[PDB]
Structure 1
Amino acid sequence: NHVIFKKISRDKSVTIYLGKRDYIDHVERVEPVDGVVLVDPELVKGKRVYVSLTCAFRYGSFRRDLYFSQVQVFPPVGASGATTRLQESLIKKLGANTYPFLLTFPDYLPCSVMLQPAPQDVGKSCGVDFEIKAFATHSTDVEEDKIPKKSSVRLLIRKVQHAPRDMGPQPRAEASWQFFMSDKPLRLAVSLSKEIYYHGEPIPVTVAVTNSTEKTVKKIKVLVEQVTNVVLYSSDYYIKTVAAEEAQEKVPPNSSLTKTLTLVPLLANNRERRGIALDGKIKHEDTNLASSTIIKEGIDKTVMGILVSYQIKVKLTVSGLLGELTSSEVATEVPFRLMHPQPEDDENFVFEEFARQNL
């Protein structure tokens, strides 16, 4: 079956039906919002129902619109053109007072990303919202048109980032250190399997420690760090751990060790959901970590609202240094991108409420 999502206006005059809650962005193109509006003909006689798509960034206090489009759904515009199969089947299944609408995304918009601060975080809440709003318009006096709220339905859809057709090079990084009073160096080489991983896919961090010093590498710790840059209004910055694995081995003096740890960055593994960039509201079940921001060529990054990136951090705890030979500890970073899997190149309908489930 195909679950159709609906939402009824307060006066029950305009009901909206979408085929999805989350619409797919896979770099090359963005999935369009096709849907239908069921109109109570007696409550709308003399009115005009439109449907609009608005993407906007919010901080707080401050707001900046990023994209706006609007389409007339009633009265029917031109030829009754059922553009998509979903629209035609929803009209055949749903009645005669059903009229279709199509709203298309551009390529210069971000994906659904929003964050609510933590106790120690200085910044305020912010996010990027995509709102599908259907509404009716009538005219009592000849001097103005009015838009009542009760004749409107408001939906908050997602623009979800899915993997593109191609992928980047293999992520690698090398680092070296010669501590004070030591002629022999400590070397660290980190490699990932691929450049793009999916939400829930295991990330195998391959660590190669070549220790030529007199000192023992007490600990090897691998982290998945999320870097979040707010690029509108205030230049807030967050760097938080979303996955951690501590290696069981030590590296004795004048020896090498190559081990592959496995980390899985998931929002489900963070009891604290504040201070990190998410793709939805915190209280919602289907909320995940924000996917890696993909800035397209030529588009100024400020329009993206919130920039989200991911990196592996390998931290080495070395003996004989803490407190007498160094004041900073050794680590290195390996960037990668995180997003959702790649898209795959007379229907039966069951209708549910649009409201996302809680937890």
Structure 2
Amino acid sequence: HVIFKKISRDKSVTIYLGKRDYIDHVERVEPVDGVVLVDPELVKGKRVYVSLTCAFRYGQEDIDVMGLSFRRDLYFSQVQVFPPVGASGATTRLQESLIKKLGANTYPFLLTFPDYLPCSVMLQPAPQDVGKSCGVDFEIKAFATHSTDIPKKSSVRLLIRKVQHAPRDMGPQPRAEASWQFFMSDKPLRLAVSLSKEIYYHGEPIPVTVAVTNSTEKTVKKIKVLVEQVTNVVLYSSDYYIKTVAAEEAQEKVPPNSSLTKTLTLVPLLANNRERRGIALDGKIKHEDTNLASSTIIKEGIDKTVMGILVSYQIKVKLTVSGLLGELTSSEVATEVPFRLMHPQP
């Protein structure tokens, strides 16, 4: 979108990139295309490498106590860029323009993503947690190696994002119908759930049309619709945990042998969901305001399991019915229907 630079401490290696965000489509991931500008006197008789790193990070910064920092590399790849051996391969329009502008000391790099990688997802801390941080982030590091024996001064690092957008074509209209049976009763309780579409945007309302046809003597006390964020953490073992994001309930109760068809609109927002621990968010560039994490789309039929933070969404409708032992005691019937919460295509 716009060309940005970062110069190393010793001013030996300068890195150039065209964009911060790199879009993961299901079929293919957008490659990291860029150039490095070197000072030939400063890089005389040393090798320069450009690396791409995907890291699972845990920060902890307690005042007066300790500073513990944890890191696990899910991906690491590097290509040599200096000294040049022959001509470079296929170059992008961005790379060709930048070599043309800067000069002869400019050298291109291309780092690619495989199929088994997550996206830039961070986890929200509580006000109980002052220095705690958790998330998956992507890094490009250009470094020189004076091998007369890695200097920190020659190395220059820059944060990037692997992002997913909403697909060109929408999925099926997500809908489910259920007919439940009780202790001895011949008559059933029927529930039908329907959403307006498969994919919703951040801030967009979700019209959940719910159609309950109660034909029993049982009274439906309240009907509750809730947006559930399914957060999956994969590292050594796969760990699923569910959190409620947005919730609304109808004012009307459903009578015995009577039906109700009501549509309920739910808006999931981070502005309503602040201060809660473990809420998955879309990864920041540098300390800016963010939203709730986008739905992760994984490539089908891949060999290796995807590690990191994987985010799923679902509409749950809960029905409290008057169960056994009378009207005073109650039991639950539920339906879960998944959906995608995603950013629009630019």
Same fold (TM over 0.5): yes
Under a length normalisation based on structure 1, what TM-score does the superposition of the two structures give? 0.79
* Equivalent position SS for 2:149: coil
Q: Which runs of 5+ in 2 are unaligned?
A: 59-68
> Aligned in 2, Cα 1:308/1:80: closer, same or farther, shift over 3 Å?
closer
CA apart distance, 1:185 = 3.2
Q: Structure 1 residues 230 and 124 mapped into 2: Cα distance closer, same or farther (>3 Å)?
A: farther
Over 3 Å counting, the alpha-carbon distance change for 1:152 and 1:188 in structure 2 is same
How far apart are the structure 2 equivalents of 1:5 and 1:67? 24
Query: What 5-or-longer segments of structure 1 have no aligned partner?
Result: 143-147, 344-359
What do residues 228-272 of structure 1 show as CA deviations (whole Å, max 9, x unaligned)? Answer: 122222443321112223334433333222222222333343222
- Give the deviation of 1:209 after TM superposition: 1.5
- Asked whether 1:166 is paired with 2:169, we answer yes
Q: Deviations along 1:23-47, whole A, 9 cap, x unmatched?
A: 1011121111111222233332332
Change (3 A) 1:218 1:335: same
Distance in 1 of aligned mates of 2:132 and 2:301: 29
Cα offset for 1:58? Answer: 4.7
What is the alpha-carbon root mean square deviation over aligned residues?
A: 3.6
Q: Is the 8 A contact 2:320 2:331 kept in 1?
A: no
Higher mean C-alpha deviation, range 98-107 or range 240-249: 240-249
Retained in 2: the 8 A contact 1:66–1:303? Answer: no
1:291 aligns with one of 294, 302, 305: 294
CA offset digits 1:139-196 (Å, max 9, x no partner): 2339xxxxx1121122221111123455433211223444557554332211123333
Moved more, 130-139 or 208-217: 208-217
The question of whether the paired residues in 1 share the 8 Å contact of 2:125 and 2:275 is answered with no
User: How has the CA–CA distance of structure 1 residues 249 and 284 changed in structure 2, closer, same or farther, with 3 Å as cutoff?
Assistant: farther
Does the aligned pair in 1 maintain the 2:160–2:285 contact within 8 Å? no
Q: Distance in 1 between matches of 2:106 and 2:263?
A: 57
State the percentage of identical aligned residues.
100
Distance between the aligned counterparts of 2:117 and 2:110, measured in 1? 18
Distance 1:234 1:126, change over 3 A: farther
Determine the C-alpha separation between the residues in 1 that align with 2:270 and 2:326: 36
CA contact (8 A) 2:294 2:342 kept: yes
Any idea what SS the aligned residue of 1:86 has? helix
Contact 2:228 2:245 in 1 (8 A): yes
* Number of residue equivalences: 336
Instruction: Report deviation, 1:310.
Output: 0.8
1:89 deviates by 2.1
SS at the partner of 1:245? strand
Whole-angstrom CA distance in 2 between matches of 1:283 and 1:47? 32
Which runs of at least 4 in structure 1 moved beyond 6 Å after TM superposition? 119-125, 319-323
- 304, 310, 318: which one pairs with 1:315? 318
Cα separation, partners in 2 of 1:30 and 1:273, compared to 1, 3 Å: farther
Structure 1 position 223 matched with structure 2 position 226: yes
Residues 309-356 of structure 1 show CA distances to partners (whole Å, capped at 9, x for unaligned) of 11101123456889856553232210123333346xxxxxxxxxxxxx
Task: Name the TM-score, length of structure 2 as normaliser.
Answer: 0.82
